[PDB]
Scaffold this active site. Structure first.
Site, PDB file in Angstrom:
ATOM      1  N   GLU A 128       3.856   8.640  -4.067  1.00 45.26           N
ATOM      2  CA  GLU A 128       4.598   8.188  -2.888  1.00 45.26           C
ATOM      3  C   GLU A 128       5.779   7.302  -3.312  1.00 45.26           C
ATOM      4  OE1 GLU A 128       2.409   6.494   0.375  1.00 45.26           O
ATOM      5  OE2 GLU A 128       1.139   8.265   0.676  1.00 45.26           O
ATOM      6  N   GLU A 149       0.874  -1.174   0.000  1.00 44.49           N
ATOM      7  CA  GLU A 149       0.000   0.000   0.000  1.00 44.49           C
ATOM      8  C   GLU A 149       0.921   1.238   0.000  1.00 44.49           C
ATOM      9  OE1 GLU A 149      -1.226  -0.442   4.749  1.00 44.49           O
ATOM     10  OE2 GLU A 149      -2.504   0.939   3.581  1.00 44.49           O
TER      11      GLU A 149
END
Ligand SMILES: CSC[C@H]1O[C@@H](n2cnc3c(N)ncnc32)[C@H](O)[C@@H]1O
Ligand SMILES: CSC[C@H]1O[C@@H](n2cnc3c(N)ncnc32)[C@H](O)[C@@H]1O
EC number: 2.1.1.320
Lengths: 300, 301, 325, 325
Positions: free
Chosen positions: D132, D123
């Site tokens: 990210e 994740e």
């Protein structure tokens, strides 16, 4: 006296080329820094692993000569805005490579073409080079007064040239330039190298360039008429454009081959000196104002 | 044999003459000197070894393209903006310059001899196409039909007024000089190569910048993704039913059939494949040249 | 910063214009080849020499001159990461050097060498010796050096000295730029030919690096405390930085004023300024602390005065100045 | 920036407080285990599962619940680089999980795995999917995935939409800080629950990443041109950013408004502002260009409007905003 440069796309030996050019009376040479046909691969094997030197040595000229006499040119195969992904990526890497070699050589200026509408990625790559490392080279954007699509001979049977007036459409190359410099955030290091064609556009198209940072004017040998004695001359209207350009103190660039073969190459330069000597002398006001042109001061 | 001591690394052209002698064109696209050279090998197996050529000569600038003009003439597309004519001496031991005319304002990229063999057509980065009178050594007509660099020009095999051109302006133009408006637009990804079919007068093939090869009929299209990169050249075989060789910047060679299906593939080249030429003696033998300085002789099944 | 930045043609020209420096490296290579290959082995034993950061080729030529004078056989690799200098090397290799020299266009920390080296030769030294990141570069190249392999240079040491100069203090003051911390100009070193200044105490050794780096789990970070006796009344404005290097055995290069290599101008002293001038009375000791810090991306220095009074710690976390890895 | 920064205890607590998200990952793992292990092999075949960026353990627990419901045997590795979260995982491993879970305190790009994985679960997605650095992290972990190995998520795509909001334009304006470029606040994305705004055109896909990344010499850099038809008179202030992800087959997560996963609040939209508002007339097209750039140290976005008028290129070279690698 005019500051002039010779635009060449074929330079077999630099030292021999510079000497010839300087004997003709030119102050600088616009030349490729990598061979213009030497297409390089950056992603795909086996071609990415091509040996030998990628270009000629910096040792071929003194550091003073690189700094003063040479204007670099971007290779014509570099297409950062290509519709082909592989071409865009190889062009990005090749453009950074060529720009960096120019900065390595300490070149006073480097020529990049604006020859189509979309130059978004060419602007992104230039903006990125400008913010990478420590350099201060000028970037001269080669842009035509009239787009090659708009000055083509009416010789395609099924694709005729439009005879109707397109007021904004005739000004298209100014928008090519305006968009490019907007993207690049009005960098002081990005200037115009205005290219002049055989047939001048209407006045409004020419006036679009008023107030623009024109650092150079490109004059192809093919735009020059021939006089009674066989010397290259310009039409009264092209002369009008030269007089405006001389007031801006632009550097003149002569491009193409000698089309006045019976006479020596410096005749093109001689004609520019002639026009320069045959302009109105500065009045009392103009002699006083010299050096103050566009120089901002605080009101007393 | 009165030839330069060494030939330049970047082999640009290879053309067999009706007897079987091999013509080579080379440029140094790197290093100190950016010149070129013309070479003749009566023994093609010796190529590119300089000490085993029949004749060799150095040109002032790079050889961007060349062609045979009959059996003794060699027409050259120069980086200088010149179109040059060279001729093998009466002894075929020396390549002597006949004419060097600077008519183009930038690199002469492509060159083609018209069917009569008396006239030629040149294409350039200066955007113009010129028609040359080889005996008078003059430009007959100059055409600014295109809006970008002229990539390729190919004279009709049998019609002296007919030729094709393609360019970075995305136009493929069919020309007939007998017309008041000589050019006609045929029809994506930019066109990079052209070859008229040797038997079908109204048929040609074109290569694109994305590796695609297309079959086009004038009177009326068949296409295949042959290469992964730009299609540099297309050369039909000398067979009654021709085979089609394609060369690319992907460094490979493909030999195709009438339906554009692949029959042969060669990954012999370590750099860009520049030219291909079919042997006039052995129809199954095809020679390629590249920027890796290799002259590869392929046996095609 | 030749690691982070690609040096320009004229910058390399300046380096090359120092004959003393190259005759010292040539002497170091000459001596090393004579200690590694006995007379009887001179035709059999080929030494693998690797120039790590070859620039435009002066160390390659110095190695070739060294092998000719020692009358020993060498196999040269010229490693350079700047592709613009690689053009110069590759034109030299085709025209002059030949097969004897293999030009490698690569970072020495990434290069998969085809064989191990007998000698690695480099000039990755700055004015404060390790400020151009020679430790990190040579640690990365170490795995391709033979177990008995030699590094030229084999050692280097930096030196510091307190200085007084209201002229240089004002020169640093004037380096205030917009869009940055108003005091960042004081938290960064400067290369400067110090002229109008007073050296307050004799230079003392700060940091030392040795190559090859023998110790397991190598740490290039450092913390040094230096105590400088002061015989005069004065004002402290910063620290002059110098270096010394051991190329091979007794063959050295130095910019430390008291041992300066005669006629060598490749390096000017470095200046570590301080934000606030510090008053020093005769007989007081100046105590300075220097750190050499790093992460995986950057190297930097931090410094502070702790006597006669404390200064703030300058350049904490490389906030004003970093050396790109 | 969970890669560059170590997330705080309360930040992880927020992530964990989303049941929909974890029941989706549990469903994806459950389905994958059933497709990989036939009923007859349920006692013989142990699947090697690796949670890459395990945080405080919700994906570890979701994997264990998934194996219990599928009635398949699993061997879990919980990889986490944040050593503060590793304390939580290690206390969970001793108290609850046991030998079945091996906690690894390491960066997934550096970890020398003792064996290859059947399934890698992660994740690492931001509000703009790849912001990210999930592509770079998973590319670095790929060598430890079996040839037939599965990555959960298997795919993700980012979306953009032009927006009008004089309220948000003023909110960005007020983010001017000292010691930085006076316009840097406009050259950086913001995570924001967009409220007082007008979406000017339907969201269009921007960038897509697939895992495992099959193509040789992988390039995570990207250049996308998007043409947005506009039916109203308005003022363009920026671009709302969203994402969609394929966890496994038909099991997905989405923050794209038209396909939003009901009840999932783990991600708010991103906002890419522009320096100068742009006037748009009805029937005009908004043309935007987005680049995903990188070097070995940083990843960043650059963007520009090219129609109806040009904007400057925002964040050239990551001068105002970078994502630490
Ligand atoms: C003579 S100044 C140092 C020289 O070494 C080169 N250099 C510095 N660091 C490295 C490295 N890690 N790998 C290869 N060359 C290097 C620089 O590009 C420069 O030419
Ligand atoms: C749930 S938010 C992402 C989680 O993955 C972790 N993470 C991010 N990148 C890496 C990496 N490269 N290796 C290991 N864990 C990672 C972060 O520390 C965080 O706990």
């Amino acid at each position: 006296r005019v500051s002039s440069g010779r635009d060449l796309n074929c330079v077999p030996e630099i030292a021999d080329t510079l000497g010839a050019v300087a004997k003709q009376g030119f102050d600088f040479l616009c030349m490729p820094v990598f061979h213009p046909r030497f297409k390089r691969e950056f992603i795909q094997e086996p071609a990415k692993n091509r040996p030998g030197p990628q270009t000629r040595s910096d040792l071929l000229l003194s550091g003073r000569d690189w700094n003063t006499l040479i204007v670099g040119k971007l290779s014509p195969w570099i297409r950062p805005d290509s519709k082909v992904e592989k071409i865009r990526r190889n062009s990005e890497a090749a453009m950074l490579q060529e720009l960096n070699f120019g900065a390595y050589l300490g070149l006073p200026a480097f020529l990049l073409p604006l020859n189509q509408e979309d130059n978004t990625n060419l602007a992104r790559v230039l903006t990125n080079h400008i913010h990478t490392g420590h350099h201060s080279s000028m970037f001269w954007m080669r842009v035509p007064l009239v787009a090659p699509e708009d000055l083509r001979d009416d010789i395609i049977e099924n694709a005729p040239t439009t005879h109707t007036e397109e007021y904004s459409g005739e000004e298209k190359t100014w928008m090519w330039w305006h968009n490019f410099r907007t993207l690049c955030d009005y960098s002081k290091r990005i200037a115009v190298a205005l290219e002049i064609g055989a047939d001048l556009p209407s006045n409004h198209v020419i006036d679009r360039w008023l107030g623009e940072p024109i650092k150079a004017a490109i004059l192809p040998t093919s735009i020059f008429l021939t006089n009674k004695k066989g010397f290259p001359v310009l039409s009264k209207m092209h002369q009008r454009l030269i007089f405006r350009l001389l007031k801006l103190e632009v550097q003149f660039i002569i491009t193409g081959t000698n089309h006045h073969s019976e006479k020596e190459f410096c005749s093109y330069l001689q004609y520019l000196e002639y026009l320069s000597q045959n302009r109105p002398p500065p009045n009392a006001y103009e002699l006083f104002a010299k050096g103050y042109e566009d120089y901002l001061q605080s009101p007393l | 044999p009165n030839a330069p001591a060494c030939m330049e690394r970047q082999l640009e052209a290879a053309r067999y003459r009706s007897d079987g002698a091999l013509l080579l064109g080379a440029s140094s696209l790197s290093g100190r000197c950016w010149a070129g050279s013309l070479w003749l090998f009566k023994d093609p197996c010796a190529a590119p070894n300089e000490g085993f050529c029949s004749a060799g000569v150095q040109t002032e600038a790079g050889v961007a393209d060349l062609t045979w003009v009959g059996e003794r003439g060699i027409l050259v597309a120069s980086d200088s903006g010149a179109v040059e004519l060279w001729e093998l001496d009466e002894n075929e031991t020396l390549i002597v310059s006949k004419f060097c005319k600077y008519e183009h304002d930038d690199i002469v990229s492509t060159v083609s001899v018209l069917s009569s063999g008396t006239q030629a057509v040149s294409g350039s980065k200066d955007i113009c196409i010129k028609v040359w009178d080889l005996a008078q050594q003059v430009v007959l007509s100059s055409y600014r039909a295109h809006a970008a660099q002229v990539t390729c020009v190919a004279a009709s095999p049998h019609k002296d007024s007919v030729f094709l051109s393609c360019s970075e302006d995305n136009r493929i133009l069919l020309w007939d000089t007998r017309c008041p408006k000589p050019a006609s637009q045929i029809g994506g990804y930019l066109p990079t190569s052209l070859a008229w079919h040797p038997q079908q007068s109204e048929v040609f093939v074109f290569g694109d910048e994305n590796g695609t090869v297309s079959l086009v009929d004038t009177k009326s299209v068949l296409s295949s993704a042959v290469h992964s990169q730009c299609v540099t050249g297309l050369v039909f075989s000398p067979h009654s039913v021709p085979f089609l060789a394609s060369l690319s910047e992907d460094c490979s060679l493909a030999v195709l059939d009438s339906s554009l299906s692949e029959l042969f593939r060669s990954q012999a080249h370590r750099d860009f494949v520049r030219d291909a030429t079919w042997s006039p003696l052995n129809h199954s033998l095809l020679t390629t040249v590249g920027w890796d300085h290799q002259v590869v002789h392929h046996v095609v099944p | 910063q030749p690691l982070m930045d690609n040096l320009e043609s004229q910058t390399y020209e300046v380096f090359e214009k120092d004959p003393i420096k190259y005759s010292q490296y040539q002497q170091a290579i000459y001596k090393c080849l004579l200690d590694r290959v006995p007379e009887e082995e001179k035709d059999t034993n080929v030494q693998v020499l690797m120039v790590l950061g070859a620039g435009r080729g002066p160390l390659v030529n110095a190695s070739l001159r060294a092998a000719k004078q020692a009358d020993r056989r060498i196999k040269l690799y010229a490693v350079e990461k700047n592709p613009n200098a690689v053009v110069t090397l590759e034109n030299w290799q085709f025209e002059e050097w030949g097969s004897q020299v293999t030009v490698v266009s690569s970072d020495m920390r990434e290069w998969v060498a085809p064989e191990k080296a007998d000698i690695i030769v480099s000039e990755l030294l700055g004015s404060f010796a390790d400020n151009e990141l020679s430790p990190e570069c040579l640690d990365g190249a170490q795995h391709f050096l033979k177990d008995d392999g030699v590094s030229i240079p084999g050692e280097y040491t930096s030196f510091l000295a307190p200085i007084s100069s209201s002229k240089l203090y004002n020169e640093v003051r004037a380096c205030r730029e917009k869009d940055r911390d108003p005091e960042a100009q004081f938290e960064m070193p400067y290369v400067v030919r110090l002229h109008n200044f007073h050296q307050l105490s004799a230079p003392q050794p700060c940091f030392t690096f040795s190559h090859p780096n023998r110790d397991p789990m190598i740490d290039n970070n450092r913390y040094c405390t230096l105590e400088f006796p002061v015989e005069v009344n004065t004002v402290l404005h910063g620290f002059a930085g110098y270096f010394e290097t051991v190329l091979y055995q007794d063959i050295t290069l130095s910019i430390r004023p008291e041992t300066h290599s005669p006629g060598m101008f490749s390096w000017f002293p470095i200046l570590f300024p301080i934000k606030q001038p510090i008053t020093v009375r005769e007989g007081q000791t100046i105590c300075v602390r220097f750190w050499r810090c790093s992460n995986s991306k950057k190297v930097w220095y931090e410094w502070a005065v702790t006597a006669p009074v404390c200064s703030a710690i300058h350049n904490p976390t490389g906030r004003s100045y970093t050396i790109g890895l």
